[PDB]
Design a protein around this nucleic acid. Sequence first.
DNA 1: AAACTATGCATGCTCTACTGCTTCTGATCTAGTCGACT
DNA 2: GACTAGATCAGAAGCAGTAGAGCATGCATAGTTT
Lengths: 244, 255, 23, 507
Amino acid sequence: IHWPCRLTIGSNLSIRIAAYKSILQERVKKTWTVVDAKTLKKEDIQKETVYCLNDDDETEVLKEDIIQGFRYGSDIVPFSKVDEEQMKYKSEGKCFSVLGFCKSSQVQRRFFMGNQVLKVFAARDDEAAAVALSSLIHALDDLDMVAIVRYAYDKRANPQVGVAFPHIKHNYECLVYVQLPFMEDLRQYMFSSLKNSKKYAPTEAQLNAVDALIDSMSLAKKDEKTDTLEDLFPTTKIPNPRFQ
Amino acid sequence: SNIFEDVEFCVMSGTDSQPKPDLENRIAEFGGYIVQNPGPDTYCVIAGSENIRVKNIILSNKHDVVKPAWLLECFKTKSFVPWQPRFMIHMCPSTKEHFAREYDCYGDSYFIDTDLNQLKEVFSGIKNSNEQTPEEMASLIADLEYRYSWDCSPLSMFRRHTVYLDSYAVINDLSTKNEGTRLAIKALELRFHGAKVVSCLAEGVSHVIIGEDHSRVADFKAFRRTFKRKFKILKESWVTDSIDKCELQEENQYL
Amino acid sequence: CPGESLINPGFKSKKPAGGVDFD
Amino acid sequence: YSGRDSLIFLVDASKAMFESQSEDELTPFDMSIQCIQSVYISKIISSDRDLLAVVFYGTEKDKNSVNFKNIYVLQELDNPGAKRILELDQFKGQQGQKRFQDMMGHGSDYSLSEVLWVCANLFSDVQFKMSHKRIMLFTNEDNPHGNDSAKASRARTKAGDLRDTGIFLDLMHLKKPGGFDISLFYRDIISIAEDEDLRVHFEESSKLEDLLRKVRAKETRKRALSRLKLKLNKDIVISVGIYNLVQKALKPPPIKLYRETNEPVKTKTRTFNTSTGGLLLPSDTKRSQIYGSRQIILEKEETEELKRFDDPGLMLMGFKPLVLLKKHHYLRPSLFVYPEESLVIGSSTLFSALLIKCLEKEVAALCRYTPRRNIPPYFVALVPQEEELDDQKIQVTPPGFQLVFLPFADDKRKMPFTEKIMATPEQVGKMKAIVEKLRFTYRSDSFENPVLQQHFRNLEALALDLMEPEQAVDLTLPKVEAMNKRLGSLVDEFKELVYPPDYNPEG
DNA sequence: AAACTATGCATGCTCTACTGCTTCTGATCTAGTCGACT
DNA sequence: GACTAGATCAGAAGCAGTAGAGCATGCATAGTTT
């Protein structure tokens, strides 16, 4: 689905843009349906959820007498849904703002988060927007820098902080947006160093054997005439065996 | 001693000399259902402090908040006392419609009389506003004093008698202030007693007071000739006698 | 072991988030 | 590091701790109470399974198992909660100080040996495994026992015994009218005497600033998602562990409570026949799917068996140049692969050799990945990751492999065809100037999730019955004013050079 | 030519189940003391 | 002998993370009726 928005740099510069989803984990269009074994019909099977208290009678309670609550240490604090909505963090939905620009080195691939990659083009049937986006992409590539941006799908969607970097090809140019981690998501784990270990140090013969293995199991062929790398095992062109 | 009969109450009072457990136990022994959260069945929530929960309830116009004092009074009299804005912090739309009939927007009623304490409570809710200007407030006060035979007050006994003092060497000049000992304090007392003192001699002046300096009598007698209305020259005994007797004295004996 | 978090032993202290600070 | 961390807050109740040097200043006792409250809130938010205690010494009353004199254990080792925070809140102000004096008292003598004995007894009572034992001393008396030397010797002996037991001691020295001097008595009691911590301090310790800095982010101990086998071929196998250095943070799951008494309820789901009313377990029912105007019926077991391809683990396929890997082919957060010598001996050596040679030749190991049983395989790339340290030698990048998922043919979506329009050099130069004006340095921990922070603030306000929730400043919102000031007129020139006179971008 | 409705997509919240790692608790066991006997 | 008390092992519970399904909400897109 084409997603219209405006890339904003400050409060006076705005470029109309359209975003699409390029890479995502595909799922099955249809799901299994529960049926009755004998009659083989979905109309003879009914699923329903009920709530009851922890008492010998197990008396039932309607959904209108059920409240929300949270765990704060060793006790439970009630928090009704209406109060939660009253106190919920509110933001202006459908925002694509440029928080700033940073060198591409500072942003590493291992920190990428989310479950999708967005491709941002200029608005359809729009020449000025196309020129502005091309200028931004070319400037970013020439300076070797990316844009740290704030992205919100809509009012109900939680705000996100991500990185947009240029993508230039011989026929088309655009921006590629990928989510970035928050401070909470990062995990600080300590691992021992293998280089300075006196018990796991490889020997010369072992290194030579590993080098031979790596050379023999190469999955890319280097054509010298064109000085080009050809992929003998392209993974991106393999259909998912699950659906097959 | 079961005044209550199948009535649901929610209590969330915090800092109070009567903490929650005593009120909950009293309600339980009074035949009253107690709940920890409000709902469609509850008909009141009690809270003696302005915590976050009561604010959230206020922002949701679906319930009534009542101060703990209401339940204490209910316990005292052993009877169901009708509600009042005095015992309330917020009203749901239905209660707003109900109280809007026999209770004015403030905390006052037009069906039952009021006493000193009740009027003080009503005035407490009202907040100071500055939509008025000195002269118009004075005029409205004068009209109110005239309307209801309301001119008998002792401290408003000079409401309609503006007085100009001869404490300036040059008339209509604020830079010629004198150092009068008796005159200055006498003018201050006259102003404090309700009289209006104007530093500039305008057409609105009505009475003129001159001290022991008789040299200025001719100047005032000449000025009053041009004025459409002629003021009266009075001596200091007039004001002193009026204050001592608490009632206005005839200017004919003090002209 | 400088920088260790007093509140949570065994975890490196994290500096407060500074957002964006233009050069 | 296995177990729980236990902390004891020893707070002096001497007269000198209740005197304020200046009218507009916080007394040491109030500062200690505030620090304790902040630590309690931080522990509740981050590690709710830890143990905390609060003990006072120098008071008139006493409360302890051994029945010593002038030692009141206000709270024993227990998981933190709102009740303890509320209890401590009644000593924050001046009226709180009067209440504390009435309840316990102040101005009495004391012996540090008894205090340390009570702390050791409190530590011994806990039945859970305790990875860390810690005590903090909030005091402003560098010479607690100057008249008597036997008491000082007993305190020194008790401190040494506690240190041998494995109990850390910290001194959060507070402001003193004269000036704190650690060299007098506390050089020995304190577990570690820093070289810089020998001069006379005229101000409160710098650790109080760290304590008062609230941390509202959950802390998770190191754990391995899976311990799998890397198979170079059918007969060469090593053991590796997988970790998630980056993981999305989610709000704690809500709990369903009863309206009347806030008593938790239990939710049960069941399936019943419409025409019979009987209850059917999840084995009587079959599964269906309508393809080609026909119904296909498969059992649950067969449906589960549809996903069986290969045993869990990683299978080597080859080595690919890193250039062929693409940044925009991101599909899923990456994982970290590290050696695991427990299962197989010799894995570390081969792993190190592979990492070294992959770094040398700039190649990535293409592998087939199956995390759990009955899960379709995926294609992943292990990119070597060297060990990178910061200035202070603290490790910032561990050594190992970065597992990055590779999309299939179904994970890509076709794009609408769009004509390309190239900007002139002048426009690119103006945009370069704007970008340079709006340059800044980026760090992975320079942003916070506003939703989670606001949720934590609201939860704390509700639990502690605060007047109003604390508002969290959002650092992800663009600084419009600063950007406008910095850019200056460049925006107008760019708009004039790129947009026609009548464009109206907003419309 | 305009309004209503079928169809689909993107995202947040929730029940439900399943797999794996870590920690706690019930159950299976040797040293010290008193006592019985011969 | 018996008791009591120390120390060792193995199973269950808690928790984290993933996958599947459903619901609700919002929005966009295209076909049918008048």
